Design an enzyme around this catalytic site. Structure first.
Site, mmCIF file in Angstrom:
data_model
loop_
_atom_site.group_PDB
_atom_site.id
_atom_site.type_symbol
_atom_site.label_atom_id
_atom_site.label_comp_id
_atom_site.label_asym_id
_atom_site.label_seq_id
_atom_site.Cartn_x
_atom_site.Cartn_y
_atom_site.Cartn_z
ATOM 1 N N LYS A 127 0.824 -1.200 0.000
ATOM 2 C CA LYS A 127 0.000 0.000 0.000
ATOM 3 C C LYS A 127 0.871 1.268 0.000
ATOM 4 O O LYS A 127 2.033 1.238 0.412
ATOM 5 C CB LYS A 127 -0.918 0.011 1.231
ATOM 6 N N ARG A 171 -10.582 1.300 14.731
ATOM 7 C CA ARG A 171 -10.452 1.950 13.434
ATOM 8 C C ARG A 171 -11.527 1.429 12.491
ATOM 9 O O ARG A 171 -12.669 1.889 12.535
ATOM 10 C CB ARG A 171 -9.066 1.678 12.848
ATOM 11 N N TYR A 230 16.158 30.189 6.564
ATOM 12 C CA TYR A 230 15.013 30.905 7.129
ATOM 13 C C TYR A 230 15.011 30.979 8.653
ATOM 14 O O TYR A 230 15.362 30.011 9.336
ATOM 15 C CB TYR A 230 13.700 30.259 6.676
ATOM 16 N N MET A 266 11.700 24.091 1.385
ATOM 17 C CA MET A 266 10.847 23.307 0.515
ATOM 18 C C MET A 266 11.603 22.351 -0.392
ATOM 19 O O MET A 266 11.188 21.208 -0.584
ATOM 20 C CB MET A 266 9.967 24.242 -0.320
HETATM 21 C C1 LIG Z 1 -0.440 -1.322 6.555
HETATM 22 C C2 LIG Z 1 -1.211 -2.560 7.190
HETATM 23 C C3 LIG Z 1 -0.529 -3.775 7.474
HETATM 24 C C4 LIG Z 1 0.985 -3.894 7.388
HETATM 25 O O1 LIG Z 1 1.584 -3.293 8.541
HETATM 26 P P1 LIG Z 1 3.145 -3.235 8.811
HETATM 27 O O2 LIG Z 1 3.327 -2.854 10.205
HETATM 28 O O3 LIG Z 1 3.686 -2.229 7.901
HETATM 29 O O4 LIG Z 1 3.658 -4.573 8.520
HETATM 30 C C5 LIG Z 1 -1.209 -4.840 7.877
HETATM 31 N N1 LIG Z 1 -2.548 -4.763 8.024
HETATM 32 C C6 LIG Z 1 -3.297 -3.603 7.780
HETATM 33 C C7 LIG Z 1 -4.793 -3.580 7.973
HETATM 34 C C8 LIG Z 1 -2.617 -2.486 7.359
HETATM 35 O O5 LIG Z 1 -3.262 -1.330 7.118
HETATM 36 C C1 LIG Z 2 9.895 29.484 -3.224
HETATM 37 C C2 LIG Z 2 10.720 30.812 -3.520
HETATM 38 C C3 LIG Z 2 10.059 32.061 -3.675
HETATM 39 C C4 LIG Z 2 8.580 32.238 -3.368
HETATM 40 O O1 LIG Z 2 8.386 32.316 -1.951
HETATM 41 P P1 LIG Z 2 6.978 32.516 -1.250
HETATM 42 O O2 LIG Z 2 7.235 32.871 0.139
HETATM 43 O O3 LIG Z 2 6.276 31.240 -1.361
HETATM 44 O O4 LIG Z 2 6.303 33.581 -1.989
HETATM 45 C C5 LIG Z 2 10.742 33.132 -4.053
HETATM 46 N N1 LIG Z 2 12.068 33.033 -4.280
HETATM 47 C C6 LIG Z 2 12.801 31.847 -4.138
HETATM 48 C C7 LIG Z 2 14.287 31.806 -4.398
HETATM 49 C C8 LIG Z 2 12.116 30.722 -3.750
HETATM 50 O O5 LIG Z 2 12.750 29.548 -3.577
#
Ligand SMILES: *Cc1c(COP(=O)(O)O)cnc(C)c1O
Ligand SMILES: *Cc1c(COP(=O)(O)O)cnc(C)c1O
Lengths: 382, 382
Positions: free
Chosen positions: A36, A134, A268, A316
């Protein structure tokens, strides 16, 4: 041919070895490889194919689309999906011979009507809510559901192929809830059998239970995470101790290396300040790529033969690292996560750094990041 | 036709309105719509097209691939990308007429050699590291870079079309670093002009600076986040106060609704326990879909005319909500994030819940989640 920014290398041989290691753990039971969420971030089809070849008799996905995608890729064999919503592709799944889970009356009625249009018997599996709270059927509603199921079976519309449940704290060894759930399962399974249900498979174990409680094995074990060489929790041990091999290695090429003076702010918010005249390096991968922003200042990275920590805030699409005195150049390879056996940082290392669990780390690797496959058979990757 | 599990509805009209609202904010300057990271999770091509139509004269992306994807979709106009690594597609980008940023000598030499093979002049923009400490050229290396650039220009290989930088704390109003960076930019810009650089555009502002410091406008403003109707920070205000309209609305259909007794555990780790006999609902979207696991127990969701909080741990593909006395049924729609004007939870609401920033929330919405487009022109969505 080779991504120059950031890419995920998936070792299909680690995958094959892991399902074998896991199959030996539950010799009396069958193994269902859970692929999944794009195989937990490793690539659904390639991994499904590899796992099958190594011995996986069952394939498990959460949504019908994920299961249908597997079929459309020519994968044969038993497949099961459990996350359904009203209006899903019941017909399509029935026609492709996929085992669907039923947790409520609404689900049973949609599949019955769909088995009609399809003109075939649907293989359904009844899920019991033994305490997770769940999905599944609560004990107080079990009687009614089991009855409606054996009745739908009589009408030839469906055929209950399994009875199963899911653990809530199996990753926490010795947790009281584990036993309580297992007993509830036994008692709920019994009532189903007496009332007329004769399932092909009885299952409740996930990766942590499969590795710890052999009494939870039954006929099928649903192993997801362990298959990709990552341990469910540090409590259970490292992939090395468990005998597992990590399948994913995230790599990135340095985009810049430059010298900055002491007292210079980095990234930042200026949450990091150079202590002295040092060499900073820019790793071109950020949270949009799957690098958790919560790992700012902690995330481990291997650059120039030494583990470095994320310097300041992770952005980002990039974050910087302090090389101190060491030197490197643009284009040099940095390893964000890989095999602890190779001295590289790991999925768990990052889970700790980001205050989360290894599960989220590998699964959240962005679609922006290309995957490169090694090992397995040539047709596995396509 | 309509996703039955979880989907992202993107209002292209909110996008068009936002760039207009933003264009009015910087009347003397031109607007560059930053659509990096799949338009912050909204869909690169559709949003790029919409923004352009509303007045965006420039398009900005981080990687060459992102920019090339825009070109391959027939988008015309000025485009610029700044995140490069040794070996990138310099030729392809030059041939597609894309402005590339240069922050080091290594970059300049690769573009020069590529402009030769291409047999054309490359439009490069020099980035100055005025204090962010990320990409760009440090002051101590500026002289050398500027010289190498005007020399490459003489050889007819390149043509410096711009000089720019990027802020580190513009989202924190009144931060000392802001002014210090602006002055460093002015002084570095000057030196470039005197030495021979005559740029088409001078820019340094991102979304927060564009909304707060009109002295940072210059010729171009690079607005990313604000374009999607999300505010850079609560300090600057809400999208409503800023005059912005959220473009994304994440919706999910309930997969189950059932009654559970008091004292029942909910989800992994059993971090939530029912206080009384209550109705639990299953939301089929989890962290693999973009719902931050760190928001476990806090994440807000609108179900049955009331805001509910994530009950316990959020899983890979689902999480549960306590409806208390209220009642709902499988298939009923739940809104995870949308417009605060409609009484729905927002991107910022979730940023708070997950201890992160709105930027990460929208951008990290998984590729597994289908996007549905409304508004704009019919050919915008394709
Ligand atoms: C994702 C999932 C699993 C697998 O779990 P793992 O811990 O990753 O092995 C088994 N059963 C259900 C219902 C799941 O959603
Ligand atoms: C992502 C980015 C932006 C835009 O920034 P925002 O805060 O999302 O407007 C501008 N300049 C550079 C160099 C970026 O990486």
């Amino acid at each position: 041919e080779t991504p120059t920014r950031v890419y995920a290398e998936i070792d299909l041989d680690a995958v094959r070895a892991n399902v074998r290691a896991l199959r030996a753990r539950a010799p009396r039971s069958a193994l269902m490889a859970v692929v999944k969420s794009n195989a937990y971030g490793h690539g659904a089809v390639p991994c499904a194919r590899a796992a099958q070849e190594a011995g996986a008799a069952w394939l498990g996905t959460a949504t019908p689309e994920e299961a249908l995608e597997l079929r459309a890729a020519g994968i044969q064999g038993r497949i099961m999906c459990w996350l359904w919503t009203p209006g899903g592709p019941w017909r399509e799944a029935i026609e492709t011979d996929i085992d669907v889970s039923v947790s409520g009356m609404w689900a049973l009625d949609e599949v019955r009507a769909a088995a009609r249009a399809a003109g075939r018997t649907a293989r359904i599996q009844l899920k019991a809510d033994t305490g997770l709270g769940r999905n599944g059927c609560q004990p107080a509603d079990w009687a009614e559901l089991v009855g409606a199921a054996v009745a739908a079976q009589a009408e030839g519309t469906v055929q209950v192929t399994g009875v199963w449940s899911h653990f809530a704290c199996a990753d926490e060894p010795g947790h009281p809830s584990i036993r309580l759930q297992l007993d509830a399962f036994r008692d709920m399974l019994a009532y189903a059998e007496k009332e007329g249900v004769d399932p092909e498979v009885r299952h409740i174990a996930n990766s942590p239970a499969t590795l710890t409680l052999p009494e939870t094995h039954f006929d099928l074990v649903r192993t997801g995470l362990a298959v990709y060489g990552v341990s469910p929790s540090p409590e259970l041990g490292t992939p090395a101790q468990l005998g597992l091999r990590p399948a994913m290695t995230l790599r990135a090429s340095l985009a810049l290396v430059k010298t900055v003076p002491a007292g210079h702010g980095v990234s930042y918010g200026h949450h990091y300040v150079t202590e002295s005249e040092t060499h900073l390096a820019l790793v071109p991968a950020g949270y949009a790529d799957g690098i958790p922003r919560n790992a700012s200042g902690r995330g481990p990275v291997l650059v120039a033969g030494k583990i470095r920590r994320a310097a300041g805030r992770i952005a980002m699409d990039q974050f910087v690292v302090d090389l101190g005195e060491d030197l490197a150049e643009a284009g040099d390879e940095a390893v964000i996560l890989g095999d602890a056996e190779r001295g590289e940082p790991t999925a768990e290392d990052w889970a700790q750094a980001a205050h989360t669990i290894a599960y989220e780390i590998v699964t959240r690797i962005g679609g922006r990041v290309p995957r490169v496959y090694l090992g397995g058979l040539e047709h596995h990757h396509h």
